[PDB]
Write a protein that binds this ligand. Sequence first.
Ligand code: HEM
Ligand SMILES: OC(Cn1cncn1)(Cn1cncn1)c1ccc(F)cc1F
Length: 529
Amino acid sequence: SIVGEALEYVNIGLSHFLALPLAQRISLIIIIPFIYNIVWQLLYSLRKDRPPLVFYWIPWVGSAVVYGMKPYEFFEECQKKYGDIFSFVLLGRVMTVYLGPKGHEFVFNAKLADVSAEAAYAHLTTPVFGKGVIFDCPNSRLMEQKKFVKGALTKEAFKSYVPLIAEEVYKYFRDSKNFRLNERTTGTIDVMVTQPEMTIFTASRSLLGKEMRAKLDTDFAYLYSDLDKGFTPINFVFPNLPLEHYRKRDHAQKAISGTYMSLIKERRKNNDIQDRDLIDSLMKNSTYKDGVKMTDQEIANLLIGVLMGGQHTSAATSAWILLHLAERPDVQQELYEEQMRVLDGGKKELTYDLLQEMPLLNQTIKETLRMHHPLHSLFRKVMKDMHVPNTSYVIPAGYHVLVSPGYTHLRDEYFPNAHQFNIHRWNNDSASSYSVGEEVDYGFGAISKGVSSPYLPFGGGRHRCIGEHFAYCQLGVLMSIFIRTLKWHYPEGKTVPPPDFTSMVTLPTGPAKIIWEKRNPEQKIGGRH
Ligand code: HEM
Ligand SMILES: OC(Cn1cncn1)(Cn1cncn1)c1ccc(F)cc1F
Protein backbone atom coordinates (compact mmCIF):
# COMPACT_ATOMS: atom_id res chain seq x y z
CA SER A 1 0.00 0.00 0.00
CA ILE A 2 2.16 2.84 -1.31
CA VAL A 3 0.52 6.23 -1.83
CA GLY A 4 3.90 7.73 -1.01
CA GLU A 5 4.69 7.54 -4.71
CA ALA A 6 1.53 9.52 -5.41
CA LEU A 7 2.74 12.19 -2.99
CA GLU A 8 6.13 12.25 -4.72
CA TYR A 9 4.37 12.79 -8.04
CA VAL A 10 2.40 15.71 -6.62
CA ASN A 11 5.73 17.42 -5.94
CA ILE A 12 7.06 16.38 -9.34
CA GLY A 13 3.89 17.64 -11.02
CA LEU A 14 4.25 20.99 -9.27
CA SER A 15 7.86 21.13 -10.46
CA HIS A 16 6.84 20.55 -14.08
CA PHE A 17 4.15 23.22 -13.75
CA LEU A 18 6.73 25.86 -12.91
CA ALA A 19 8.72 24.99 -16.04
CA LEU A 20 5.86 25.31 -18.54
CA PRO A 21 6.49 27.73 -21.42
CA LEU A 22 5.50 31.32 -20.58
CA ALA A 23 2.77 31.04 -23.22
CA GLN A 24 1.31 27.98 -21.49
CA ARG A 25 1.59 29.50 -18.01
CA ILE A 26 -0.18 32.69 -19.09
CA SER A 27 -2.90 30.58 -20.72
CA LEU A 28 -3.40 28.71 -17.43
CA ILE A 29 -3.33 32.01 -15.54
CA ILE A 30 -6.40 32.95 -17.58
CA ILE A 31 -7.89 29.46 -17.67
CA ILE A 32 -7.79 28.32 -14.04
CA PRO A 33 -9.61 31.27 -12.47
CA PHE A 34 -12.14 31.18 -15.31
CA ILE A 35 -12.80 27.50 -14.65
CA TYR A 36 -12.77 27.90 -10.86
CA ASN A 37 -15.27 30.77 -11.03
CA ILE A 38 -17.76 28.58 -12.88
CA VAL A 39 -17.54 25.64 -10.44
CA TRP A 40 -17.93 28.09 -7.54
CA GLN A 41 -21.19 29.52 -8.91
CA LEU A 42 -22.75 26.10 -9.56
CA LEU A 43 -21.80 25.15 -6.00
CA TYR A 44 -23.29 28.44 -4.77
CA SER A 45 -26.67 27.65 -6.37
CA LEU A 46 -26.86 24.63 -4.04
CA ARG A 47 -27.02 26.85 -0.96
CA LYS A 48 -30.52 27.89 0.10
CA ASP A 49 -29.65 30.42 2.79
CA ARG A 50 -28.54 32.67 -0.08
CA PRO A 51 -30.66 34.42 -2.73
CA PRO A 52 -30.19 33.21 -6.33
CA LEU A 53 -27.01 34.63 -7.89
CA VAL A 54 -27.07 35.76 -11.52
CA PHE A 55 -24.72 33.60 -13.58
CA TYR A 56 -21.73 35.38 -15.14
CA TRP A 57 -18.71 34.41 -17.25
CA ILE A 58 -15.98 36.95 -16.49
CA PRO A 59 -14.66 36.82 -12.89
CA TRP A 60 -14.71 40.04 -10.83
CA VAL A 61 -16.39 41.96 -13.69
CA GLY A 62 -19.66 40.09 -13.12
CA SER A 63 -22.85 41.54 -14.59
CA ALA A 64 -21.36 45.06 -14.55
CA VAL A 65 -21.82 45.56 -18.29
CA VAL A 66 -25.53 44.76 -18.54
CA TYR A 67 -26.27 46.36 -15.18
CA GLY A 68 -24.23 49.39 -16.17
CA MET A 69 -26.03 50.06 -19.44
CA LYS A 70 -29.64 48.97 -18.82
CA PRO A 71 -30.25 48.37 -15.08
CA TYR A 72 -34.06 48.25 -15.24
CA GLU A 73 -34.08 45.73 -18.09
CA PHE A 74 -31.55 43.68 -16.16
CA PHE A 75 -33.84 43.84 -13.13
CA GLU A 76 -36.94 42.77 -15.07
CA GLU A 77 -35.13 39.75 -16.52
CA CYS A 78 -33.77 38.68 -13.14
CA GLN A 79 -37.23 39.26 -11.68
CA LYS A 80 -38.88 36.85 -14.13
CA LYS A 81 -36.20 34.21 -13.63
CA TYR A 82 -35.64 34.47 -9.88
CA GLY A 83 -38.36 36.65 -8.35
CA ASP A 84 -37.87 39.79 -6.25
CA ILE A 85 -34.67 38.89 -4.39
CA PHE A 86 -31.51 38.07 -6.31
CA SER A 87 -27.80 38.77 -6.24
CA PHE A 88 -25.25 39.68 -8.87
CA VAL A 89 -21.52 40.33 -8.96
CA LEU A 90 -20.43 43.88 -9.74
CA LEU A 91 -16.74 44.79 -10.23
CA GLY A 92 -15.59 42.83 -7.18
CA ARG A 93 -18.73 43.30 -5.10
CA VAL A 94 -21.80 41.15 -4.50
CA MET A 95 -25.04 43.12 -4.78
CA THR A 96 -28.29 41.77 -3.41
CA VAL A 97 -31.28 43.39 -5.09
CA TYR A 98 -34.64 43.36 -3.29
CA LEU A 99 -37.30 44.64 -5.68
CA GLY A 100 -40.70 46.13 -4.87
CA PRO A 101 -42.21 47.77 -1.75
CA LYS A 102 -40.90 44.91 0.42
CA GLY A 103 -37.42 45.75 -0.87
CA HIS A 104 -38.01 49.40 -0.02
CA GLU A 105 -38.78 48.42 3.57
CA PHE A 106 -35.94 45.90 3.82
CA VAL A 107 -33.26 48.45 2.91
CA PHE A 108 -34.59 51.95 3.66
CA ASN A 109 -35.79 50.88 7.13
CA ALA A 110 -32.86 48.55 7.87
CA LYS A 111 -31.37 48.76 11.37
CA LEU A 112 -28.49 51.22 11.76
CA ALA A 113 -26.29 48.33 12.95
CA ASP A 114 -27.19 46.16 9.96
CA VAL A 115 -26.22 48.33 6.98
CA SER A 116 -24.07 51.36 6.17
CA ALA A 117 -24.55 54.01 3.51
CA GLU A 118 -21.30 55.87 4.20
CA ALA A 119 -19.44 52.57 3.84
CA ALA A 120 -20.81 52.39 0.30
CA TYR A 121 -20.50 56.02 -0.77
CA ALA A 122 -17.65 57.71 1.19
CA HIS A 123 -15.03 56.76 -1.40
CA LEU A 124 -17.00 58.67 -4.01
CA THR A 125 -18.42 61.65 -2.15
CA THR A 126 -15.58 62.61 0.22
CA PRO A 127 -13.09 63.43 -2.59
CA VAL A 128 -15.70 65.65 -4.27
CA PHE A 129 -17.24 67.42 -1.28
CA GLY A 130 -14.36 67.38 1.20
CA LYS A 131 -13.62 65.99 4.65
CA GLY A 132 -15.75 65.76 7.75
CA VAL A 133 -19.25 65.82 6.25
CA ILE A 134 -21.99 63.71 4.62
CA PHE A 135 -20.31 60.29 4.44
CA ASP A 136 -16.91 61.25 5.94
CA CYS A 137 -18.38 61.12 9.43
CA PRO A 138 -20.52 58.83 11.58
CA ASN A 139 -24.24 58.60 10.74
CA SER A 140 -25.09 60.57 13.88
CA ARG A 141 -23.15 63.50 12.43
CA LEU A 142 -24.94 63.19 9.08
CA MET A 143 -28.27 63.21 10.94
CA GLU A 144 -27.41 66.57 12.54
CA GLN A 145 -25.93 67.99 9.34
CA LYS A 146 -29.31 67.34 7.67
CA LYS A 147 -30.99 69.08 10.61
CA PHE A 148 -28.72 72.10 10.13
CA VAL A 149 -29.45 72.26 6.40
CA LYS A 150 -33.21 71.85 6.92
CA GLY A 151 -33.17 75.00 9.06
CA ALA A 152 -32.66 77.18 6.02
CA LEU A 153 -35.40 75.23 4.20
CA THR A 154 -38.51 76.54 5.92
CA LYS A 155 -41.75 77.88 4.42
CA GLU A 156 -40.55 81.39 5.30
CA ALA A 157 -37.31 80.73 3.44
CA PHE A 158 -39.24 79.51 0.39
CA LYS A 159 -41.37 82.66 0.39
CA SER A 160 -38.16 84.66 0.05
CA TYR A 161 -36.53 82.25 -2.44
CA VAL A 162 -39.41 82.37 -4.96
CA PRO A 163 -38.90 85.99 -6.15
CA LEU A 164 -35.13 85.37 -6.20
CA ILE A 165 -35.47 82.21 -8.28
CA ALA A 166 -37.94 84.02 -10.54
CA GLU A 167 -35.42 86.84 -11.13
CA GLU A 168 -32.76 84.31 -12.17
CA VAL A 169 -35.04 82.59 -14.69
CA TYR A 170 -36.02 85.86 -16.36
CA LYS A 171 -32.37 86.99 -16.38
CA TYR A 172 -31.48 83.71 -18.09
CA PHE A 173 -34.24 84.19 -20.69
CA ARG A 174 -32.93 87.71 -21.25
CA ASP A 175 -29.15 87.18 -21.35
CA SER A 176 -28.37 83.54 -22.23
CA LYS A 177 -27.29 82.81 -25.81
CA ASN A 178 -29.72 79.90 -25.72
CA PHE A 179 -32.64 82.33 -25.50
CA ARG A 180 -32.22 86.13 -25.71
CA LEU A 181 -35.99 86.65 -25.64
CA ASN A 182 -35.62 90.40 -26.27
CA GLU A 183 -33.89 89.64 -29.57
CA ARG A 184 -35.38 86.33 -30.73
CA THR A 185 -38.94 84.98 -30.72
CA THR A 186 -38.02 81.36 -31.47
CA GLY A 187 -34.99 79.08 -31.31
CA THR A 188 -33.52 75.63 -30.70
CA ILE A 189 -31.93 74.55 -27.40
CA ASP A 190 -30.26 71.49 -25.94
CA VAL A 191 -32.08 70.94 -22.63
CA MET A 192 -28.93 69.26 -21.30
CA VAL A 193 -27.15 72.58 -21.79
CA THR A 194 -29.80 75.01 -20.51
CA GLN A 195 -31.06 73.14 -17.44
CA PRO A 196 -27.74 72.57 -15.65
CA GLU A 197 -27.07 76.29 -16.18
CA MET A 198 -30.53 77.37 -14.98
CA THR A 199 -30.33 75.05 -12.01
CA ILE A 200 -26.98 76.29 -10.73
CA PHE A 201 -27.94 79.95 -11.22
CA THR A 202 -31.24 79.61 -9.34
CA ALA A 203 -29.87 77.39 -6.56
CA SER A 204 -26.73 79.53 -6.03
CA ARG A 205 -28.76 82.73 -5.76
CA SER A 206 -31.26 81.32 -3.27
CA LEU A 207 -29.14 78.95 -1.15
CA LEU A 208 -25.67 80.57 -1.37
CA GLY A 209 -26.61 84.21 -1.88
CA LYS A 210 -25.79 87.11 -4.16
CA GLU A 211 -21.99 87.03 -3.73
CA MET A 212 -21.74 83.39 -4.76
CA ARG A 213 -24.23 83.85 -7.60
CA ALA A 214 -22.10 86.77 -8.80
CA LYS A 215 -19.03 84.50 -8.90
CA LEU A 216 -20.72 82.25 -11.49
CA ASP A 217 -20.54 85.10 -14.03
CA THR A 218 -16.74 84.63 -14.09
CA ASP A 219 -14.00 82.07 -14.75
CA PHE A 220 -14.82 80.66 -11.32
CA ALA A 221 -17.73 78.79 -12.94
CA TYR A 222 -15.20 76.45 -14.56
CA LEU A 223 -14.27 74.99 -11.17
CA TYR A 224 -17.82 73.70 -10.65
CA SER A 225 -17.44 71.97 -14.00
CA ASP A 226 -14.13 70.48 -12.87
CA LEU A 227 -15.66 69.44 -9.55
CA ASP A 228 -18.58 67.94 -11.47
CA LYS A 229 -16.25 65.51 -13.22
CA GLY A 230 -15.25 64.03 -9.87
CA PHE A 231 -18.87 62.98 -9.40
CA THR A 232 -19.09 59.99 -11.78
CA PRO A 233 -19.43 56.21 -11.25
CA ILE A 234 -15.82 55.76 -12.41
CA ASN A 235 -14.75 57.09 -9.01
CA PHE A 236 -16.84 54.26 -7.53
CA VAL A 237 -14.04 51.83 -8.39
CA PHE A 238 -11.16 54.17 -9.21
CA PRO A 239 -11.43 57.13 -6.78
CA ASN A 240 -7.80 58.29 -7.12
CA LEU A 241 -5.78 57.82 -10.31
CA PRO A 242 -2.78 60.14 -10.96
CA LEU A 243 -4.49 61.72 -14.00
CA GLU A 244 -5.51 65.31 -14.75
CA HIS A 245 -9.22 64.67 -14.13
CA TYR A 246 -8.54 63.95 -10.46
CA ARG A 247 -6.27 66.97 -9.91
CA LYS A 248 -8.74 69.47 -11.36
CA ARG A 249 -11.40 67.96 -9.09
CA ASP A 250 -9.18 68.17 -6.00
CA HIS A 251 -8.14 71.69 -6.95
CA ALA A 252 -11.78 72.69 -7.47
CA GLN A 253 -12.90 71.42 -4.06
CA LYS A 254 -10.10 73.39 -2.41
CA ALA A 255 -10.78 76.46 -4.55
CA ILE A 256 -14.56 76.44 -4.09
CA SER A 257 -14.52 75.59 -0.37
CA GLY A 258 -11.87 78.32 -0.08
CA THR A 259 -14.29 80.82 -1.59
CA TYR A 260 -17.09 79.77 0.78
CA MET A 261 -14.80 80.00 3.82
CA SER A 262 -13.72 83.44 2.63
CA LEU A 263 -17.33 84.65 2.74
CA ILE A 264 -18.06 82.97 6.07
CA LYS A 265 -15.09 84.67 7.75
CA GLU A 266 -15.89 88.00 6.08
CA ARG A 267 -19.48 87.90 7.40
CA ARG A 268 -18.43 86.98 10.94
CA LYS A 269 -15.81 89.75 11.02
CA ASN A 270 -18.37 92.33 9.90
CA ASN A 271 -21.17 90.92 12.09
CA ASP A 272 -23.06 90.61 8.81
CA ILE A 273 -24.95 87.45 9.76
CA GLN A 274 -28.66 87.62 8.97
CA ASP A 275 -31.39 85.26 7.71
CA ARG A 276 -30.74 85.51 3.97
CA ASP A 277 -29.35 82.17 2.82
CA LEU A 278 -28.01 78.74 3.76
CA ILE A 279 -24.63 80.25 4.70
CA ASP A 280 -26.08 82.61 7.32
CA SER A 281 -28.13 79.69 8.64
CA LEU A 282 -25.22 77.27 9.06
CA MET A 283 -23.07 80.01 10.65
CA LYS A 284 -25.82 80.58 13.22
CA ASN A 285 -26.81 76.94 13.51
CA SER A 286 -24.13 74.25 13.21
CA THR A 287 -23.29 73.11 16.72
CA TYR A 288 -23.64 69.37 17.29
CA LYS A 289 -25.48 68.11 20.37
CA ASP A 290 -22.21 67.09 22.05
CA GLY A 291 -21.13 70.72 21.81
CA VAL A 292 -18.63 70.35 18.96
CA LYS A 293 -18.97 73.10 16.36
CA MET A 294 -18.63 72.46 12.63
CA THR A 295 -15.50 74.16 11.35
CA ASP A 296 -15.61 76.75 8.58
CA GLN A 297 -14.09 74.08 6.35
CA GLU A 298 -16.81 71.59 7.27
CA ILE A 299 -19.54 74.18 6.69
CA ALA A 300 -18.05 74.94 3.26
CA ASN A 301 -17.79 71.23 2.44
CA LEU A 302 -21.41 70.66 3.51
CA LEU A 303 -22.42 73.52 1.19
CA ILE A 304 -20.68 71.84 -1.74
CA GLY A 305 -22.32 68.45 -1.21
CA VAL A 306 -25.79 69.90 -0.70
CA LEU A 307 -25.55 72.19 -3.76
CA MET A 308 -23.96 69.48 -5.92
CA GLY A 309 -26.54 66.82 -5.02
CA GLY A 310 -29.50 69.12 -5.57
CA GLN A 311 -27.85 70.40 -8.77
CA HIS A 312 -27.83 67.01 -10.50
CA THR A 313 -31.23 65.74 -9.32
CA SER A 314 -33.02 68.97 -10.23
CA ALA A 315 -31.28 69.64 -13.57
CA ALA A 316 -32.08 66.11 -14.73
CA THR A 317 -35.69 66.49 -13.64
CA SER A 318 -36.43 69.85 -15.29
CA ALA A 319 -34.82 68.46 -18.45
CA TRP A 320 -37.25 65.50 -18.42
CA ILE A 321 -40.27 67.73 -17.73
CA LEU A 322 -39.44 69.84 -20.79
CA LEU A 323 -38.78 66.78 -22.91
CA HIS A 324 -42.08 65.11 -21.97
CA LEU A 325 -44.05 68.31 -22.44
CA ALA A 326 -42.41 68.85 -25.85
CA GLU A 327 -44.62 66.12 -27.34
CA ARG A 328 -47.67 67.05 -25.29
CA PRO A 329 -49.10 70.45 -26.29
CA ASP A 330 -52.35 69.36 -24.59
CA VAL A 331 -50.55 69.32 -21.21
CA GLN A 332 -48.78 72.67 -21.87
CA GLN A 333 -52.20 74.09 -22.75
CA GLU A 334 -53.72 72.74 -19.56
CA LEU A 335 -50.80 73.98 -17.45
CA TYR A 336 -51.13 77.43 -19.04
CA GLU A 337 -54.82 77.78 -18.09
CA GLU A 338 -53.98 76.95 -14.48
CA GLN A 339 -51.32 79.70 -14.53
CA MET A 340 -53.91 82.16 -15.88
CA ARG A 341 -56.54 81.29 -13.27
CA VAL A 342 -54.19 81.18 -10.26
CA LEU A 343 -52.20 84.30 -11.19
CA ASP A 344 -55.19 86.23 -12.61
CA GLY A 345 -54.06 86.46 -16.24
CA GLY A 346 -50.52 86.84 -14.96
CA LYS A 347 -51.34 90.05 -13.13
CA LYS A 348 -50.53 88.52 -9.73
CA GLU A 349 -46.86 88.10 -8.87
CA LEU A 350 -45.81 84.50 -8.27
CA THR A 351 -45.44 83.66 -4.57
CA TYR A 352 -44.69 80.47 -2.66
CA ASP A 353 -48.33 80.37 -1.53
CA LEU A 354 -49.67 80.66 -5.08
CA LEU A 355 -47.32 77.84 -6.15
CA GLN A 356 -49.22 75.66 -3.68
CA GLU A 357 -52.46 76.39 -5.54
CA MET A 358 -51.05 74.95 -8.77
CA PRO A 359 -51.86 71.23 -8.48
CA LEU A 360 -51.46 70.36 -12.18
CA LEU A 361 -48.01 71.99 -12.26
CA ASN A 362 -47.07 70.07 -9.10
CA GLN A 363 -48.55 66.85 -10.53
CA THR A 364 -46.38 67.29 -13.63
CA ILE A 365 -43.28 67.28 -11.44
CA LYS A 366 -44.67 64.32 -9.48
CA GLU A 367 -45.32 62.32 -12.69
CA THR A 368 -41.93 63.20 -14.18
CA LEU A 369 -40.28 62.00 -10.96
CA ARG A 370 -42.28 58.78 -11.37
CA MET A 371 -41.02 58.01 -14.86
CA HIS A 372 -37.51 59.30 -14.21
CA HIS A 373 -36.17 58.62 -10.73
CA PRO A 374 -32.79 60.39 -10.88
CA LEU A 375 -31.16 57.58 -8.88
CA HIS A 376 -31.98 54.17 -10.33
CA SER A 377 -30.14 52.26 -7.58
CA LEU A 378 -29.39 53.01 -3.94
CA PHE A 379 -26.77 51.02 -2.04
CA ARG A 380 -25.95 49.97 1.50
CA LYS A 381 -23.01 47.85 2.60
CA VAL A 382 -24.18 45.00 4.82
CA MET A 383 -22.34 45.17 8.15
CA LYS A 384 -23.70 41.98 9.71
CA ASP A 385 -25.61 38.93 8.46
CA MET A 386 -29.21 39.87 7.70
CA HIS A 387 -32.12 37.46 7.60
CA VAL A 388 -34.67 38.22 4.89
CA PRO A 389 -38.11 37.88 6.60
CA ASN A 390 -40.44 35.08 5.42
CA THR A 391 -37.53 33.44 3.60
CA SER A 392 -34.63 31.17 4.47
CA TYR A 393 -32.27 33.74 2.91
CA VAL A 394 -29.32 35.23 4.76
CA ILE A 395 -27.39 38.22 3.41
CA PRO A 396 -23.92 37.88 4.94
CA ALA A 397 -21.82 40.84 6.06
CA GLY A 398 -19.66 42.15 3.24
CA TYR A 399 -22.44 41.91 0.68
CA HIS A 400 -24.17 45.04 -0.56
CA VAL A 401 -27.93 45.52 -0.75
CA LEU A 402 -29.48 47.51 -3.59
CA VAL A 403 -32.91 49.13 -3.53
CA SER A 404 -34.62 50.54 -6.64
CA PRO A 405 -37.90 52.42 -6.12
CA GLY A 406 -37.47 53.87 -9.62
CA TYR A 407 -38.03 50.36 -10.94
CA THR A 408 -41.31 49.96 -9.08
CA HIS A 409 -42.31 53.37 -10.44
CA LEU A 410 -42.40 51.73 -13.86
CA ARG A 411 -44.42 48.60 -12.97
CA ASP A 412 -47.99 48.26 -14.31
CA GLU A 413 -49.05 46.54 -11.06
CA TYR A 414 -48.57 49.73 -9.06
CA PHE A 415 -49.03 52.30 -11.80
CA PRO A 416 -51.43 51.28 -14.59
CA ASN A 417 -49.85 51.97 -18.00
CA ALA A 418 -46.65 52.91 -16.22
CA HIS A 419 -44.80 53.83 -19.39
CA GLN A 420 -47.42 56.45 -20.20
CA PHE A 421 -46.86 60.03 -19.04
CA ASN A 422 -50.14 61.01 -17.36
CA ILE A 423 -50.25 63.82 -14.82
CA HIS A 424 -53.91 63.10 -14.13
CA ARG A 425 -53.10 59.84 -12.35
CA TRP A 426 -52.24 62.25 -9.48
CA ASN A 427 -55.60 64.08 -9.45
CA ASN A 428 -56.42 65.15 -5.89
CA ASP A 429 -52.98 63.86 -4.89
CA SER A 430 -50.56 66.60 -5.91
CA ALA A 431 -48.39 66.56 -2.76
CA SER A 432 -44.68 65.93 -3.39
CA SER A 433 -45.16 63.02 -0.96
CA TYR A 434 -46.72 62.40 2.45
CA SER A 435 -46.80 59.87 5.29
CA VAL A 436 -49.96 57.75 5.30
CA GLY A 437 -49.53 56.90 8.98
CA GLU A 438 -47.06 56.83 11.86
CA GLU A 439 -43.96 59.04 11.99
CA VAL A 440 -40.46 58.88 13.47
CA ASP A 441 -37.52 61.28 13.92
CA TYR A 442 -33.93 60.21 13.20
CA GLY A 443 -32.50 63.59 14.10
CA PHE A 444 -33.67 65.90 11.30
CA GLY A 445 -37.42 65.94 11.87
CA ALA A 446 -40.45 63.65 11.86
CA ILE A 447 -40.77 61.55 8.71
CA SER A 448 -42.83 58.53 7.62
CA LYS A 449 -42.13 55.42 9.69
CA GLY A 450 -43.28 53.10 6.92
CA VAL A 451 -41.45 53.12 3.59
CA SER A 452 -43.69 50.66 1.71
CA SER A 453 -45.15 53.22 -0.70
CA PRO A 454 -44.61 52.09 -4.31
CA TYR A 455 -43.90 55.77 -5.04
CA LEU A 456 -40.64 56.78 -3.33
CA PRO A 457 -38.88 59.49 -5.34
CA PHE A 458 -37.16 60.83 -2.18
CA GLY A 459 -36.39 57.52 -0.50
CA GLY A 460 -37.16 56.97 3.16
CA GLY A 461 -35.71 56.17 6.56
CA ARG A 462 -32.67 57.87 8.09
CA HIS A 463 -31.16 58.65 4.68
CA ARG A 464 -34.35 60.25 3.33
CA CYS A 465 -34.02 63.42 1.20
CA ILE A 466 -34.48 66.79 2.86
CA GLY A 467 -34.42 68.81 -0.36
CA GLU A 468 -37.81 67.77 -1.70
CA HIS A 469 -39.63 71.00 -0.81
CA PHE A 470 -36.75 73.05 -2.13
CA ALA A 471 -36.74 71.01 -5.33
CA TYR A 472 -40.49 71.56 -5.85
CA CYS A 473 -40.07 75.25 -5.11
CA GLN A 474 -37.20 75.59 -7.59
CA LEU A 475 -38.80 73.36 -10.27
CA GLY A 476 -42.15 75.05 -9.64
CA VAL A 477 -40.95 78.62 -10.20
CA LEU A 478 -38.91 77.44 -13.17
CA MET A 479 -41.80 75.60 -14.89
CA SER A 480 -44.39 78.25 -14.01
CA ILE A 481 -42.32 80.84 -15.93
CA PHE A 482 -41.46 78.48 -18.81
CA ILE A 483 -45.16 77.75 -19.29
CA ARG A 484 -46.31 81.37 -19.14
CA THR A 485 -43.50 82.53 -21.45
CA LEU A 486 -42.94 79.82 -24.07
CA LYS A 487 -44.48 77.03 -26.11
CA TRP A 488 -42.12 74.27 -27.25
CA HIS A 489 -41.99 71.12 -29.36
CA TYR A 490 -39.67 68.49 -30.85
CA PRO A 491 -37.67 68.80 -34.05
CA GLU A 492 -39.46 66.69 -36.68
CA GLY A 493 -39.09 62.96 -36.10
CA LYS A 494 -37.69 63.38 -32.59
CA THR A 495 -39.24 62.11 -29.36
CA VAL A 496 -38.39 61.55 -25.69
CA PRO A 497 -34.78 60.30 -25.50
CA PRO A 498 -33.79 57.18 -23.54
CA PRO A 499 -32.16 57.55 -20.12
CA ASP A 500 -28.38 57.62 -19.81
CA PHE A 501 -28.04 55.23 -16.87
CA THR A 502 -24.22 55.37 -16.95
CA SER A 503 -23.97 58.65 -15.01
CA MET A 504 -24.48 59.27 -11.28
CA VAL A 505 -27.91 60.66 -12.16
CA THR A 506 -30.22 59.13 -14.80
CA LEU A 507 -30.26 62.15 -17.10
CA PRO A 508 -31.51 61.97 -20.72
CA THR A 509 -29.21 60.89 -23.53
CA GLY A 510 -28.10 64.08 -25.27
CA PRO A 511 -28.05 66.18 -27.27
CA ALA A 512 -31.79 66.41 -26.62
CA LYS A 513 -33.12 69.37 -28.53
CA ILE A 514 -36.39 71.23 -28.32
CA ILE A 515 -37.68 74.19 -30.29
CA TRP A 516 -39.11 77.08 -28.28
CA GLU A 517 -41.42 79.96 -29.24
CA LYS A 518 -42.50 83.05 -27.34
CA ARG A 519 -46.19 83.06 -26.40
CA ASN A 520 -45.85 86.83 -26.68
CA PRO A 521 -43.34 87.80 -29.41
CA GLU A 522 -43.34 91.46 -28.28
CA GLN A 523 -42.91 90.79 -24.55
CA LYS A 524 -39.70 92.37 -23.23
CA ILE A 525 -37.62 91.52 -20.17
CA GLY A 526 -36.34 94.68 -18.49
CA GLY A 527 -33.20 95.40 -16.47
CA ARG A 528 -29.62 96.15 -17.51
CA HIS A 529 -27.16 93.89 -19.34
C1 HEM B 1 -35.85 65.99 -7.82
C2 HEM B 1 -35.10 66.27 -6.74
C3 HEM B 1 -34.55 65.20 -5.77
C4 HEM B 1 -34.75 63.87 -5.67
C5 HEM B 1 -35.67 62.97 -6.52
C6 HEM B 1 -33.95 63.37 -4.56
C7 HEM B 1 -33.86 62.06 -4.10
C8 HEM B 1 -33.17 61.65 -2.97
C9 HEM B 1 -33.08 60.29 -2.48
C10 HEM B 1 -33.74 59.07 -3.15
C11 HEM B 1 -32.32 60.28 -1.37
C12 HEM B 1 -31.96 59.05 -0.50
C13 HEM B 1 -30.66 58.40 -0.97
C14 HEM B 1 -30.50 57.06 -0.28
O1 HEM B 1 -31.46 56.62 0.40
O2 HEM B 1 -29.42 56.44 -0.43
C15 HEM B 1 -31.91 61.65 -1.11
C16 HEM B 1 -31.12 62.06 -0.07
C17 HEM B 1 -30.69 63.35 0.20
N1 HEM B 1 -30.86 64.46 -0.62
FE1 HEM B 1 -32.18 64.47 -2.24
N2 HEM B 1 -33.27 64.44 -4.02
C18 HEM B 1 -33.61 65.56 -4.74
C19 HEM B 1 -33.16 66.85 -4.53
C20 HEM B 1 -32.38 67.28 -3.48
C21 HEM B 1 -32.11 68.66 -3.15
C22 HEM B 1 -32.65 69.88 -3.94
C23 HEM B 1 -31.31 68.66 -2.07
C24 HEM B 1 -30.73 69.86 -1.28
C25 HEM B 1 -31.14 71.13 -1.42
C26 HEM B 1 -31.07 67.28 -1.68
C27 HEM B 1 -30.31 66.86 -0.62
C28 HEM B 1 -30.31 65.60 -0.06
C29 HEM B 1 -29.73 65.26 1.22
C30 HEM B 1 -29.01 66.21 2.20
C31 HEM B 1 -29.99 63.76 1.39
C32 HEM B 1 -29.58 62.88 2.59
C33 HEM B 1 -28.56 61.84 2.15
C34 HEM B 1 -28.40 60.82 3.25
O3 HEM B 1 -28.92 61.08 4.36
O4 HEM B 1 -27.77 59.77 3.00
N3 HEM B 1 -31.74 66.46 -2.57
N4 HEM B 1 -32.45 62.45 -2.11
O1 LIG C 1 -27.81 60.99 -2.35
C1 LIG C 1 -26.85 61.79 -3.05
C2 LIG C 1 -25.61 60.93 -3.36
N1 LIG C 1 -25.87 59.88 -4.32
C3 LIG C 1 -26.36 58.67 -4.13
N2 LIG C 1 -26.44 58.01 -5.27
C4 LIG C 1 -25.97 58.90 -6.15
N3 LIG C 1 -25.61 60.05 -5.64
C5 LIG C 1 -27.54 62.26 -4.35
N4 LIG C 1 -28.61 63.20 -4.11
C6 LIG C 1 -29.82 62.98 -3.60
N5 LIG C 1 -30.50 64.10 -3.51
C7 LIG C 1 -29.63 65.01 -4.00
N6 LIG C 1 -28.48 64.52 -4.38
C8 LIG C 1 -26.45 62.98 -2.17
C9 LIG C 1 -27.04 63.16 -0.93
C10 LIG C 1 -26.72 64.24 -0.12
C11 LIG C 1 -25.79 65.13 -0.58
F1 LIG C 1 -25.48 66.19 0.20
C12 LIG C 1 -25.17 65.02 -1.80
C13 LIG C 1 -25.52 63.94 -2.56
F2 LIG C 1 -24.90 63.79 -3.76
